[PDB]
DNA sequence: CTGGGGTCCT
DNA sequence: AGGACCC
């Protein structure tokens, strides 16, 4: 019952899209900027020392010749992302989205059909596509090895189809679960793929230097674990189950300790259509209810176009604010306005979000972030 | 000089 | 409503 999973991660996604829009940007060192942050950059700027999530001032110091493009509008990135996901859904219907640029696909059924169409004389002719992690030797008599190789071939066909149909490049990783497929996809970058045979799992899991490098272990869990002297993957592997059960609860403890061994039983979930739409806007300061009302109007209009095109009606609205630490107030959308989506649906919505806003803050302040979300879609 | 999004769990 | 995680 050993699965074959592929994880696809796009190379400098936003930068890649911006280079497609304006091929002029292809040669020069490019960075995509949101407010004071260079959120991603092309390979050239990366050679010049620019790194992801670097300060615009630090990136400009490291690279004064750097050219920046504003990427605070995720419209193009969202379109392209869902094009990638749909194309992968053409291979296997079960595709899971992670962020805008990552996709898990379960290739087990497909690999099975491909193998069952083959003849024994062709079984020795099975070859890997792309890198093999750790230069490990392929045993063509190992059925798991064969299935993983076929998975590598399917991954290659996926990347080639992404390039020929969408002009996008990315990295792929083929493994037996989602954690390992994601961990091995980034070994060779960019525009390469790597397959992980089982015998090398531990090697991969011990190539990490920080426990936060494990997907599923974030900032709070990492700092917490550090407070107990757990700093390496082997520390977490060998640590006492009961203590971290006490420190993190039973669920977090068991699951992340299983992750420390490369074990991940979670299935690939069909993402399908989005569960929510939302838009944000940060600022140095917000102190006027009129300006807050105007920003909320700006978010509302774009959200209305986005939801109108989707063809599903949201049944909950929420407002999020950040103080001088985030707070939110939501409520159902009236069926009167819900049914008539696409009339001046604006004015009542502004009234609703302004009432929630008053619940949050007293007009009778310093806000640094305003966000609006349509949730509970149908 | 720290964005703009998403998911699921409690 | 908030908090954990992901990009
Ligand atoms: N914290 C983050 C992480 C990613 N992103 C956006 C910018 C990225 O272009 C896109 C993909 O994220 P990413 O895979 O973490 N880095 P990117 O794809 O740019 O480069 P690679 O390292 O994957 O080649 O999401 C963001 O806006 N905020
Ligand atoms: Mg990427």
């Amino acid at each position: 019952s050993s699965r074959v999973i592929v994880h696809v991660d796009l190379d400098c996604f936003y930068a890649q899209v911006e280079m497609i829009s304006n091929p002029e940007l292809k040669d020069k060192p490019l960075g995509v900027q949101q407010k004071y942050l260079v959120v991603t950059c092309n390979y050239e700027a990366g050679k010049l020392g620019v790194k992801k999530l670097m300060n615009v001032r630090d990136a400009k110091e490291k690279c004064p010749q750097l050219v920046l493009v504003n990427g605070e509008d995720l419209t193009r990135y969202r379109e392209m992302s869902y094009k990638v996901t749909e194309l992968l859904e053409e291979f296997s219907p079960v595709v899971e989205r992670l962020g805008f640029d990552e996709n898990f696909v379960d290739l087990t059924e497909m690999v099975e059909k491909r193998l069952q169409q083959l003849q024994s004389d062709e079984l020795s002719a099975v070859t890997v596509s792309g890198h093999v992690y750790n230069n490990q030797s392929i045993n063509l008599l190992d059925v798991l090895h064969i299935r993983l190789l076929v998975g590598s071939q399917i991954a290659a066909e996926m990347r080639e189809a992404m390039y020929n149909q969408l002009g996008l490049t990315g990295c792929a990783g083929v493994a037996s679960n989602k954690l390992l497929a994601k961990l091995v996809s980034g070994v060779f970058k960019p525009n390469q793929q790597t397959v992980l045979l089982p015998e090398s799992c531990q090697h991969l899991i011990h190539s990490l230097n920080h426990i936060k490098e494990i997907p599923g272990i974030g900032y709070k869990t990492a700092k917490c674990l550090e407070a107990l002297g757990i700093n390496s993957v082997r520390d977490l592997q060998t640590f006492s189950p009961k203590i971290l059960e006490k420190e993190l609860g039973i669920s977090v403890a068991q699951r992340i300790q299983k992750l420390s061994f490369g074990e991940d039983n979670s299935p690939v979930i069909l993402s399908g259509p989005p569960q929510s739409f939302s838009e944000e806007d940060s600022f140095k300061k917000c102190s006027s209810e009129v300006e807050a009302k105007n920003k909320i109007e700006e978010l509302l209009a774009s959200l209305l176009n986005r939801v109108c095109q989707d063809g599903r009606k949201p049944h909950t609205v929420r407002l999020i604010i950040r103080r001088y630490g985030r707070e939110s107030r939501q409520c159902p959308i009236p069926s009167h306005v819900i049914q008539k989506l696409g009339y001046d649906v604006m004015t009542p919505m502004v009234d609703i979000l302004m009432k929630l806003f008053r619940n949050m803050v007293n007009v009778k302040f310093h806000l640094t972030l305003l966000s609006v979300c349509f949730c509970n879609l149908k």
Side-chain angles (χ1 to χ4, degrees), chain A residues 1-25 27 29-42 44-120 122-211 213-219 221-245 247-283 286-288 292 294 296-307 309-312 314-323 325-338 341-342 344-350 352-354 356-363 365-377:
Chain A
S1 73
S2 203
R3 304 173 293 166
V4 178
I5 309 299
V6 58
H7 170 258
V8 181
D9 184 320
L10 292 162
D11 307 308
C12 49
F13 182 43
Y14 292 0
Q16 222 184 144
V17 175
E18 297 295 338
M19 293 174 131
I20 292 181
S21 298
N22 186 22
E24 302 257 34
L25 297 158
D27 311 82
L30 181 53
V32 182
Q33 179 189 12
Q34 290 174 336
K35 291 292 182 290
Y36 291 142
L37 195 62
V38 171
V39 91
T40 190
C41 64
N42 62 338
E44 303 78 323
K47 300 180 188 313
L48 293 162
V50 191
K51 308 187 84 70
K52 293 175 284 179
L53 307 175
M54 179 169 289
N55 282 69
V56 61
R57 165 172 49 193
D58 295 5
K60 269 155 51 184
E61 170 270 354
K62 209 80 60 179
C63 182
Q65 59 283 24
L66 189 58
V67 29
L68 312 184
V69 170
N70 189 259
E72 304 187 333
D73 190 349
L74 313 186
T75 296
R76 278 171 180 162
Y77 312 139
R78 200 174 302 115
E79 302 181 325
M80 211 73 61
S81 166
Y82 273 105
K83 298 202 177 186
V84 177
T85 296
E86 290 178 27
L87 165 58
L88 297 183
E89 286 173 302
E90 202 167 315
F91 287 77
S92 173
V94 183
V95 178
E96 185 166 334
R97 289 173 55 88
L98 193 56
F100 280 7
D101 83 319
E102 287 171 35
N103 290 268
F104 294 103
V105 189
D106 186 313
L107 305 173
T108 307
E109 191 172 316
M110 196 168 165
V111 159
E112 272 306 310
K113 251 241 148 184
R114 285 205 180 190
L115 275 189
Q116 294 170 2
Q117 283 162 4
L118 293 193
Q119 251 56 28
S120 78
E122 296 161 314
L123 266 191
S124 176
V126 177
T127 40
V128 64
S129 187
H131 301 273
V132 174
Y133 180 80
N134 211 9
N135 287 308
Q136 190 190 322
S137 302
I138 299 177
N139 193 323
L140 300 174
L141 299 171
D142 196 331
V143 60
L144 305 181
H145 284 210
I146 290 293
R147 285 151 56 93
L148 289 172
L149 295 195
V150 179
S152 71
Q153 286 163 14
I154 296 176
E157 299 173 9
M158 287 176 164
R159 298 197 302 120
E160 180 202 27
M162 289 170 36
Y163 189 70
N164 289 347
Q165 291 184 19
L166 305 180
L168 284 169
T169 70
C171 298
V174 179
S176 72
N177 63 50
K178 295 203 301 163
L179 165 67
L180 298 169
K182 188 180 190 305
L183 283 180
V184 78
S185 74
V187 176
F188 288 93
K189 278 168 54 172
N191 198 30
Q192 305 174 65
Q193 60 188 76
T194 314
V195 61
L196 173 70
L197 305 178
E199 299 79 34
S200 298
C201 167
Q202 292 303 301
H203 193 280
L204 183 60
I205 209 55
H206 286 293
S207 54
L208 309 176
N209 299 295
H210 309 115
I211 310 189
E213 285 165 55
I214 297 181
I217 308 188
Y219 200 94
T221 309
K223 246 90 191 181
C224 182
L225 285 178
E226 305 174 15
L228 303 99
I230 311 179
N231 299 345
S232 63
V233 177
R234 202 178 297 276
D235 290 338
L236 185 52
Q237 287 184 354
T238 52
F239 198 79
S240 155
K242 343 291 178 314
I243 305 185
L244 80 143
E245 278 186 18
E247 245 66 21
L248 320 167
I250 174 67
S251 181
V252 177
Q254 283 198 248
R255 193 226 317 151
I256 71 173
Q257 196 173 62
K258 227 213 175 200
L259 294 175
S260 59
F261 289 89
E263 293 163 0
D264 176 26
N265 63 18
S266 61
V268 180
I269 297 309
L270 174 67
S271 271
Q275 304 288 331
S276 68
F277 295 87
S278 78
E279 298 231 358
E280 303 189 350
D281 189 20
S282 37
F283 11 72
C286 182
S287 57
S288 36
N294 273 86
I296 289 176
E297 284 201 1
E298 291 182 12
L299 307 168
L300 271 167
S302 186
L303 280 173
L304 288 169
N305 184 7
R306 293 177 53 187
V307 66
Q309 271 236 136
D310 184 16
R312 308 142 82 207
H315 286 54
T316 299
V317 67
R318 89 196 298 162
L319 172 88
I320 311 97
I321 69 166
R322 192 162 51 184
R323 42 89 225 205
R326 298 160 82 100
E327 323 186 25
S328 60
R329 295 285 128 83
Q330 32 161 131
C331 85
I333 313 179
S335 41
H336 192 150
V337 38
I338 285 190
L341 247 304
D344 190 278
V345 309
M346 188 89 188
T347 313
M349 290 303 306
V350 187
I352 309 170
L353 281 153
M354 285 323 291
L356 306 160
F357 181 75
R358 299 179 223 284
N359 193 317
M360 314 233 54
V361 304
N362 42 12
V363 179
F365 48 84
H366 192 228
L367 295 179
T368 165
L369 173 274
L370 262 60
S371 184
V372 183
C373 184
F374 299 161
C375 347
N376 193 4
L377 331 180

